Design a protein around this ligand. Structure first.
Ligand SMILES: [Mg+2]
Ligand SMILES: [Mg+2]
Ligand SMILES: [Mg+2]
Lengths: 240, 244, 212, 235, 204, 195, 222, 233, 231
């Protein structure tokens, strides 16, 4: 079997294949996660270079791992499917053996472990993918939001963004997100997430996707018109 | 030892691109143009054979359009031999699903499976990727008529109308201009042929340089029919649409 | 052998006998048939002595690894299922095991799982396993209530083993008692059946068939 | 290119030496061993204020009597911790006892040189392993990706290590109390950290015979930081 | 205990003038217990028909297997499989499980689309082909069917006459077998039309 | 395990399964639920060898739940029954076969029809208006053959089921400690708590 | 058909004192009605103040002891010459035995020594690894002849104080090493009279804080 | 698992003051057929060890080849192969005993009973037994098969315990062995008159005696024995 | 240069550079001495610390009751090779009831190290070993190089500045070989030998490591206050 060590150290102590995997994430469409007091919202960018697209059947950017946890990503689309599949299998395996669904932290730790493994295994390259994993632990009302990256490090975030121009939207979130008082309602959280994407997106038409996750497996994706109403209200307040 | 001669087919560039995937896509850009158009009452698949000869036996020839099952077909752009490897795998996958669940495989599930196979060749094994892009035309009872494409990266996307192979930039602009959502199969047939006629590198578009196929619910009542067009039938539709 | 375990208001009572036989030959009267998996979990020994000892000690190692990795006490459900899934892999090879995995957690409350070498895993309120199980069930069924005090429940478990020890030839020696609370199990001593029988006879007025 | 297991002309393994450079870029971790216990402390170093700092887990329990702090590519440490936990528990299963701190450290270090063309590269993380056993008492070990481990009275790893080690050279003596060691770790962390030290961007822990391995609450550490500030202002 | 007589059932096939016929009972049982009266044992892949008697799980499994294989055949060959070729595929497929066989008694029936020649064949559980001119029998009442077919059959029967002969062969054989009956179906097969007839019979 | 019954009426499927668990000499439990929900509109009851029954049922449940998440779509009862049959047909030629018999009751939301499938441990599948496993059919089928109509209401189906259980309680030597009854219709799965 | 097992007879006895422990065994090795050896040592010093005997099928017994001695050696190598405690040795032997759960060592194993508080300790194993700490334990051929005697004379079972008539038990007073050896000798002398496989010689290994001492006594050779 | 086909009967042995003696007859039986009459079942290893084998002859010939290969292997890169690092009886035995127990543990035994007789470097007598089960034991006298039942009782009258060994000369020991071989010839139906005897002495070394015969037999009393009870003639 | 990328490549003058680079790791290692008489064999090793807070890296490893070694170079490689020796010593005892000859132990180490010098993918061992032992032919001292070369000697030294101790032993050859039945005097000679390799630093109580094996002496290691007698 093909055993070649592709991920190796360089004289300055860097693993370039892992660092170049991050450059693939930088190229990917922007993704953002914001947690309120009783919800988490995942926002995603859709590049409008592709029209004549069939939006019914085209792979959506946010994926359910279980009924209570969701995963979005920035980077190589094909790579992300492999992580999503593995995560979904592990979620069902956890329910089968422990008789309890995965915690958000556990699911994150698993996906991050798979990513790490691909940075020191022979014959494989790292995943060119960073993920945002969000949801609520079983029988718990505290919102959860985690991030992973190609190296395999992971951590919890009050709010976070990944992908292209993520430096700009992180700048926005760092000045607009207050920890002492997070977005108290679904409306406030969605509004802040749409606002953060409008710093980068271009047109507020079919370029913004929003998914709201609430406790007790209550997950819904907002439609074009519902998002368009947020886009309208934001700019009308801005004209002042 | 052997390391000396390893090209390392599954590595990132400094910019975060997969060298071999990008170069395979360059190969595919020289292949004959294939077009897919989705209508309300069916799907059209049209494709251009590459600079043929008068001595080529056309009626027994197949390089572009392949049947995966009774409900799903593909148009090929790239290395034909590479495509046939993947096609046979997809045919087996469809039958595995049918044996397991006693239902015809949904179109996306088949497309995802083939795309995942392509993905694997970019991440592990140290082998070159498949130099193939597919257009999938298919029907199932969940989403109805569906058009997809997949490329050597293993990424796939859904489309109302799409082109692969040569002159896709020019072809996609022409499709984007004349396509409408309430369009019918007969109109889509005309659009596909008109687009190929304008984008072709050949002097004129003739029956011997084309492969054509439709997927219609124009099958008596509540069922779907695949029609791979014969050479004479391509000749007739060229006269009907006013190209020859 | 006679082992029992039952759920009640104040947690779980576990009671076992102490005898081990090789045919008619009494090899031991001092066998520990309650396995202390960890400070919060107990398991009972019936069927194969080695099979129960080995795999329930192993179970404790797996439960310890779980709480290191997850930073949280393992559920009785998850602990019992690790053992049942393990023995199910060995099914047909000749393992002999009939055990009650007993614990008390926040999310579950007091919980008992009957786990068995042919793959069975049953949640329940009252379980009795061994050659003297039928004798113990009689005393249990006719005297059991949810609202038993800890004192009365401990006696009921002790008295039920005594009933089995008396009638069943392969049960006896001594009685070991345990009380499982949310904060852990508590050992309630070793009680010689010889001395216990006469004490219970006099104080209770039972066993009038026996001269003392 | 060149072998992954290649020797340099100086007699050093290229990949091992390069992994040591990755560890120099890592956040600081400090350990101090005393007769009353061993203290472990780390710099958290959050990349952004929106990152919830309590999810940064750079101090980890291996068993009740053994703790561990890390520095470098911290993702690489997860499989090392897993192995260590498994080794500790397995030995207890086989021998009905606690495992010696040295024997645990040796088991972790056996993984280090299992790379070639087994894993594709060395680990890019260094570990401070602290613990207690009956035979050798309170101990602190430094486990490297070379497979070598040294026992230390006190040790610092990461980006501020050589400055911190020079400070530990002067401050450590054989009569240090646990409280004195706690303040000393906090003092030296504060010295080498970029950002200002508080309870949210630094973490303390210890291992004692009585109570075992404990990660300190942010409230507990905050009081020790306030105690440190006052005693430095006292002269 | 004997896998070939747990579920019960029968299949019979006959040739005629420019036609073939294949028929089966509809019973599925668990030994003495009758479970289903709608268990059809005849399947078709294009114009080739396959009857299968024996262990019912294997009957279902083999139908799914030959559907799988004939679908792939068609995609690659760009034509429907013929009875002679399909017969060889059944034989091959059965013999590959020589030392762990499917407990079945398959029967092939069809007309070659090019030559127009009527074709029937039978197999044992490991693939030995029996290519008879006249008739093929299979199942728990195979002895009874041999007796009926051997006396009732004559060559070159017209489609509507052949229907009566095969129907009477099946029915009377099934009525002398505890594990067969509970309904019956007869296929009459010509070069470009196939008729399927359900028979009325005693339900004990 | 012992008695599992099934009946498909006009607009629902009803599954009835015994509550007793016996380990040789003693009845260990009298409230055991011998069923698993595979999807919101599909229920599977089971009976066979100890351990293997629950192991198989939960394994199937996990696989169908995995499919549901991957595709964001509920498989039809027919599709689920075919998947289950293949697993049992695979199992019968294994080193150690699953000795498990099942009934699959589902409501097809596409066709708006209830469906009942009977599958034994060999992988023998049949679609039926009413079915059973083991000796249960020997006592109950003569009553079902007489009274069953395809246009029965759910309430009539339950009454016919009560008559079947009464005959079982009269003529069967074993005490199976009554039955848990569950209904599968367009609105999902619910348990009849008084029977 | 080939039978991989055999029976070499023999009887062994382990008794735990207050600050000592003894492990005794007869020296006769047999098959069927023949004597193989009148002196074939059966109790072994395994190092770290632990004595061991694996009675039954002698080939399996020798294999197990040999593997345990090897385990002690490697415990020293792997854990900085740490002394293997009697409880740790016991758990280790469980794993050696259960490792052959489905093709067992056909032996009854007993080990003796001192625990970590200096008190006398004996552990007893079944063929597949189930074990327990015990005060008094006989194994092998004449175990049924010896144990009832020990119940009576060591634990004072069924013995009450004169004058009380069953009301007050005889108190469990501690026995010396000299007193225990007397009971061991009388146990084996009695077993020799009534069991054909017991005889020839008796070898006793005594364990104290000072180390491991041996004593040998002749038994009847018929 | 197998069955023995061509077999060899008793091997007998004992210790004496300065060394050990071992003996075995030259027969290879095929059930009740006395098929092969020139089989050597004592196999010397160097000048200090003799391995006596009974049971299956094909397995004996295999063991014979293992011991031959052992000597070759010991000589490799060993300048002291004929001195301090020569093969000892104890080394040869432990090797065989390992093999026998390993083979029984794979359920494919070498169907033999073996006695290893020799003298160690320090002059100590070595005598130990191993069989198809891997069972081992030592004693002042050792014997296999019929020898265990008939030879041991006779040899134990000369050396009953350890303290009798220094009191037993080589002449007395050989005499006892030779008498035992006669008794076995009288009473074992699978024995022969022809046998081999080997003495390993710490002073005089290895003496290997071939083509020995049982002599001084008593048969004359048979002429007076008539019928089975009442027959006078 | 162009021929040092892997162990599978000879240079134009027939040299194996990866092996030579592995040999260089030994020269960087701390000094250790070995010497023997007819009755005893001694190892003396200068242990190296990382700093003043650190412990002194152990240099001597026991392989059996009658055999053991001292190391200089990559310590994990010594652990691998000493583990292999432990196993081979153990196999000899279990299977043949025989203590493994020191010469045969040297042959086994040579062959294990050789396989890593002729195959692609692997690397040579980066450690040198001094093996002492007492077997049936008396006291022995071996020197192992990771090239595969094993040599039997009266005395030697390996590591940094080992040439000083090696010259001293070459002078003292006739004296220390005659030190029979006097373990203390043989260690004294070894301590005096290793002193010829010291610069700036001297032999302290936690610096020095000594091991001995002999006629009626199992392989035992002395550290701490047990070597203060010889300082
Ligand atoms: Mg009939
Ligand atoms: Mg009937
Ligand atoms: Mg006797």
């Amino acid at each position: 079997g093909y055993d070649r060590a592709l991920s190796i150290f360089s004289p300055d102590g860097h693993i370039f294949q892992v660092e170049y995997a991050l450059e693939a994430v930088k190229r990917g469409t922007c993704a953002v996660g914001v947690k309120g007091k009783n919800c988490v919202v995942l926002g995603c960018e859709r590049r409008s270079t592709l029209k004549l697209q069939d939006t019914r059947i085209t792979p959506s950017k946010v994926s359910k791992i279980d009924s209570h946890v969701v995963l979005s990503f920035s980077g190589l689309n094909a790579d992300s499917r492999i992580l999503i599949e593995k995560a979904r299998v592990e979620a069902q395996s956890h329910r089968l053996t422990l008789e309890d669904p995965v915690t958000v932290e556990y699911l994150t730790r698993y996906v991050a472990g798979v990513q790490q493994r691909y940075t020191q295994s022979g014959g494989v390259r790292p995943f060119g993918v960073s993920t945002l994993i969000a949801g609520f632990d079983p029988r718990d009302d505290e919102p959860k939001l985690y991030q992973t990256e190609p190296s395999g490090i992971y951590s919890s975030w009050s709010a976070q963004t990944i992908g292209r121009n993520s430096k700009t939207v992180r700048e926005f979130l760092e000045k607009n997100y207050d920890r002492k008082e997070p977005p108290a309602t679904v409306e406030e959280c969605v509004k802040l997430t749409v606002r953060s994407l409008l710093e980068v997106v271009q047109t507020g038409a079919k370029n913004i996707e929003i998914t709201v996750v609430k406790p007790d497996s209550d997950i819904v994706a907002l439609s074009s018109e519902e998002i368009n109403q947020y886009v309208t209200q934001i700019e009308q307040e801005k004209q002042e | 030892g052997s390391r000396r001669y390893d090209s390392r087919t599954t590595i990132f560039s400094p910019e975060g691109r997969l060298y071999q995937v990008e170069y395979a896509l360059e190969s595919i850009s020289h292949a004959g143009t294939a077009i897919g158009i989705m209508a309300s009452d069916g799907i059209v698949l049209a494709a251009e054979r590459k600079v043929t000869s008068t001595l080529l036996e056309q009626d027994t020839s197949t390089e572009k359009l392949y049947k995966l099952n009774d409900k799903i077909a593909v148009a090929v752009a790239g290395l034909t031999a590479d495509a046939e490897i993947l096609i046979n795998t997809a045919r087996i996958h469809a039958q595995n699903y049918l044996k397991t669940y006693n239902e015809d495989i949904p179109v996306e599930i088949l497309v995802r499976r083939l795309s995942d196979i392509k993905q694997g060749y970019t991440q592990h094994g140290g082998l070159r990727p498949f130099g193939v892009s597919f257009i999938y035309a298919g029907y199932d009872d969940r989403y109805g008529y569906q058009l997809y494409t997949s490329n050597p990266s293993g990424n796939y996307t859904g489309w109302k109308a799409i082109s692969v192979g040569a002159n896709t930039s020019a072809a996609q602009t022409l499709l984007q201009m004349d396509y409408k959502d309430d369009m019918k199969v007969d109109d889509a047939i005309e659009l596909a042929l008109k687009t190929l006629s304008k984008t072709t590198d050949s002097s004129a578009l003739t029956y011997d340089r084309l492969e054509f196929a439709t997927i219609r619910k124009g099958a008596n009542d509540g069922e779907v029919y695949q029609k791979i067009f014969k050479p004479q039938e391509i000749k007739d539709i060229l006269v009907k649409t006013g190209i020859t | 052998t006679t082992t029992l375990a039952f759920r009640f208001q104040g947690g779980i009572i576990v009671a076992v006998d102490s005898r081990a036989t090789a045919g008619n030959w009494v090899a031991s009267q001092t066998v520990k048939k309650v396995i202390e998996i960890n400070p919060f979990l107990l398991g009972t020994m019936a069927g194969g002595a080695a099979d129960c000892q080995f795999w329930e000690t192993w179970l404790g190692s797996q439960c310890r690894l779980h709480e290191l990795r997850e930073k949280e006490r393992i559920s009785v459900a998850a602990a019992s299922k690790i053992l049942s899934n393990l023995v199910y892999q060995y099914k047909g090879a000749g393992l002999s095991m009939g055990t009650m995995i007993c614990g008390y957690t926040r999310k579950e409350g007091p919980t008992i799982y009957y786990v068995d070498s042919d793959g069975t895993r049953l949640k329940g309120d009252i379980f009795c396993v061994g050659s003297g199980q039928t004798f113990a069930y009689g005393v249990l069924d006719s005297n059991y209530k949810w609202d038993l005090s800890v004192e009365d429940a401990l006696y009921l478990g002790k008295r039920s083993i005594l009933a089995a020890a008396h009638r069943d030839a392969y049960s006896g020696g001594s009685v070991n008692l345990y009380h499982v609370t949310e904060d852990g199990w508590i050992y309630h001593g070793n009680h010689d059946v010889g001395e216990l029988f006469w004490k219970v006879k006099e104080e209770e007025g039972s066993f009038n068939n026996v001269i003392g | 290119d060149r072998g992954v297991s290649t020797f340099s002309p100086e007699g050093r393994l290229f990949q091992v030496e390069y992994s040591l450079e990755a560890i120099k870029l890592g956040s600081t971790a400090i350990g101090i061993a005393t007769k009353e216990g061993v203290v472990l402390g780390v710099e958290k170093r959050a990349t952004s204020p929106l990152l919830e700092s309590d999810s940064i887990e750079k101090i980890v329990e291996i068993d009740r009597h053994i703790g561990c702090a890390m520095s470098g590519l911290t993702a690489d440490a997860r499989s090392m911790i897993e192995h260590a936990r498994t080794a500790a528990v397995t030995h207890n299963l086989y021998y009905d006892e606690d495992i010696n701190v040295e024997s645990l450290t040796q088991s972790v270090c056996d993984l280090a040189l299992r790379f070639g063309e087994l894993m594709s590269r060395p680990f890019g993380v260094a570990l401070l392993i602290a613990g207690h056993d009956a035979d050798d008492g309170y101990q602190l070990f430094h486990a490297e990706p070379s497979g070598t481990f040294y026992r230390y009275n006190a040790k610092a790893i990461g980006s501020g290590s050589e400055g911190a080690q020079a400070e530990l050279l002067n401050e450590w003596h054989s009569s240090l109390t646990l409280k004195e060691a706690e303040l000393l770790v906090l003092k030296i962390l504060k010295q080498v950290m970029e950002e200002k030290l508080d309870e949210n961007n630094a973490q303390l822990s210890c291992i004692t015979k009585q109570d075992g391995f404990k990660i300190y609450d942010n409230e507990k550490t905050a009081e020790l930081i306030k105690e440190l500030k006052e005693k430095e202002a006292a002269e | 205990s004997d896998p070939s007589s747990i579920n019960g059932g029968i299949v019979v096939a006959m040739t005629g003038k420019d036609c073939v016929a294949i028929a089966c009972d509809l019973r599925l049982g668990s030994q003495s217990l009758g479970v289903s009266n709608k268990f059809e044992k005849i399947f078709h892949y294009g114009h080739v028909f396959l009857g299968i008697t024996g262990l019912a799980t294997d009957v279902t499994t083999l139908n799914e297997m030959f559907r799988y294989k004939t679908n792939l055949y068609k995609l690659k060959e760009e034509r429907a499989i013929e009875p002679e070729t399909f017969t060889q595929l059944v034989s091959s497929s059965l013999y590959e499980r020589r030392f762990g066989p499917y407990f079945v008694g398959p029967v092939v029936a069809g007309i070659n689309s090019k030559s127009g020649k009527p074709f029937i064949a039978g197999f044992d559980l490991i693939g030995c082909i029996d290519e008879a001119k006249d008739f093929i029998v299979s199942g728990t009442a195979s002895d009874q069917l041999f007796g009926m077919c051997e006396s009732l059959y004559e060559p070159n029967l017209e489609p509507e006459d052949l229907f009566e002969t095969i129907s009477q062969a099946l029915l009377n054989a099934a009525d002398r077998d505890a594990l067969s009956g509970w309904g019956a179906v007869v296929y009459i097969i010509k070069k470009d039309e196939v008729v399927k007839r359900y028979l009325k019979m005693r339900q004990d | 395990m012992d008695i599992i019954l099934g009946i498909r009426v006009q607009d629902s499927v009803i599954l009835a399964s015994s509550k007793a668990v016996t380990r040789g000499i003693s009845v260990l439990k009298d409230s055991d639920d011998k069923t698993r929900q595979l999807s919101p509109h599909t229920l599977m009851s089971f009976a066979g060898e100890a351990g293997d029954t629950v192991q198989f049922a939960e394994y199937i449940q996990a696989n169908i739940q995995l499919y549901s998440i991957r595709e964001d779509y509920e498989l039809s009862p027919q599709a689920v029954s075919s998947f289950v049959r293949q697993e049992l047909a695979k199992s019968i030629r294994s080193r150690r076969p699953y000795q498990v018999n099942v009934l699959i009751g589902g409501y097809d939301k596409k066709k708006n029809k209830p469906e009942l499938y009977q599958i034994d441990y060999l992988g023998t599948k049949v679609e039926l208006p009413y079915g059973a496993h083991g000796y249960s059919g020997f006592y109950t089928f003569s009553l079902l053959d007489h009274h069953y109509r395809p246009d029965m209401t759910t309430e009539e189906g339950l009454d016919l089921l009560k008559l079947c259980v009464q005959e079982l309680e009269k003529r069967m030597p074993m005490d199976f400690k009554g039955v848990i009854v569950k209904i599968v219709d367009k609105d999902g799965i619910r348990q009849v708590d008084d029977f | 058909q080939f039978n991989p097992y055999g029976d070499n007879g023999g009887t062994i006895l382990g008794i735990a004192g207050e600050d000592f422990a003894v492990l005794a065994g007869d020296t006769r090795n047999i098959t069927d009605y023949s004597i193989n050896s009148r002196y074939e040592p059966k109790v072994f010093d395994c190092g770290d103040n632990i004595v061991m005997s694996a009675n039954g099928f002698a080939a399996d017994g020798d294999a197990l002891v040999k593997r345990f001695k090897n385990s002690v050696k490697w415990y020293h190598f792997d854990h900085n010459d740490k002394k293997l405690s009697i409880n740790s040795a016991a758990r280790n032997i469980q794993h050696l035995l259960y490792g052959k759960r489905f093709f067992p060592y056909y032996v009854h194993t007993i080990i003796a020594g001192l625990d970590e508080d200096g008190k006398g300790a004996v552990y007893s194993f079944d063929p597949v690894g189930s074990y327990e700490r015990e005060q008094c334990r006989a194994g092998g051929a004449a175990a049924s002849l010896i144990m009832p005697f020990l119940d009576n004379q060591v634990n004072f079972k069924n013995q009450y104080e004169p004058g009380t008539n069953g009301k007050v038990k005889k108190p469990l007073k501690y026995l010396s090493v000299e007193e225990v050896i007397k009971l061991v000798r009388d146990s084996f002398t009695s077993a020799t009279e009534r069991h054909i496989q017991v005889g020839d010689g008796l070898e006793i290994l005594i364990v104290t804080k000072d180390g491991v001492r041996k004593e040998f006594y002749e038994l009847k050779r018929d | 698992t197998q069955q023995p086909i061509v077999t060899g009967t008793s091997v007998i042995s004992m210790k004496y003051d300065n060394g050990v003696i071992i003996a075995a007859d030259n027969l290879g039986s095929y059930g009740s057929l006395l098929r092969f009459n020139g089989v050597e079942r004592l196999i010397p290893v160097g000048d200090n060890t003799v391995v006596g084998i009974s049971g299956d002859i094909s397995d004996m010939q295999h063991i014979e080849r293992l011991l031959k290969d052992l000597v070759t292997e010991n000589a490799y890169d060993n300048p002291l192969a004929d001195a301090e690092e020569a093969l000892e009886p104890s080394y040869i035995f432990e090797y065989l005993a390992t093999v026998m127990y390993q083979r029984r543990s794979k359920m494919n035994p070498l169907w033999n009973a073996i006695i290893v007789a020799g003298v160690q470097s320090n002059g100590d007598q070595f005598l130990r037994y191993v069989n198809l089960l891997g069972v081992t034991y030592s004693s002042p006298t050792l014997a296999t098969g019929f020898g265990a039942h008939m030879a041991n009782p006779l040899l134990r009258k000369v050396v009953d315990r350890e303290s009798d060994i220094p009191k037993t000369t080589v002449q007395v020991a050989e005499e006892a062995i030779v008498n035992a071989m006669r008794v076995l010839y009288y009473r074992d139906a699978r024995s022969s008159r022809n046998f081999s005897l080997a003495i390993i002495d710490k002073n005089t070394g290895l003496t290997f005696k071939k083509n020995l015969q049982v002599e001084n037999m008593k048969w004359d009393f048979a002429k007076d024995i008539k019928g089975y009870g009442t027959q006078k003639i | 240069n162009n021929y040092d990328g892997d162990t599978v490549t000879f240079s134009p003058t027939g040299r194996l550079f990866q092996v030579e680079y592995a040999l260089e790791a030994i020269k960087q290692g701390s000094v250790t001495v070995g010497l023997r008489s007819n009755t005893h064999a001694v190892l003396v090793a200068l242990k190296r610390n990382a700093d003043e807070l650190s412990s002194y890296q152990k240099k001597i490893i026991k392989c059996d009751e009658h055999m053991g070694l001292s190391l200089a170079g990559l310590a994990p490689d010594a652990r691998v090779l000493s583990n292999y020796l432990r196993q081979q010593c153990n196999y000899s005892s279990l299977v043949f009831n025989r203590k493994l000859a020191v010469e045969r132990a040297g042959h086994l180490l040579c062959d294990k190290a050789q396989k890593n010098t002729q195959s692609y993918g692997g690397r040579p061992y980066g450690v040198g070993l001094l093996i002492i032992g007492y077997d049936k032919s008396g006291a022995h001292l071996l020197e192992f190089q990771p090239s595969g070369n094993v040599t039997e000697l009266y005395g030697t030294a390996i590591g940094a500045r080992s040439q000083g101790a090696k010259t001293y032993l070459e002078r003292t050859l006739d004296t220390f070989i005659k030190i029979d039945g006097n373990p203390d005097e043989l260690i004294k000679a070894g301590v005096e030998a290793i002193s010829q390799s010291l610069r700036d630093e001297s032999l302290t109580v936690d610096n020095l490591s000594i091991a001995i094996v002999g006629k009626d002496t199992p392989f035992t290691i002395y550290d701490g206050e047990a070597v203060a007698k010889y300082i």
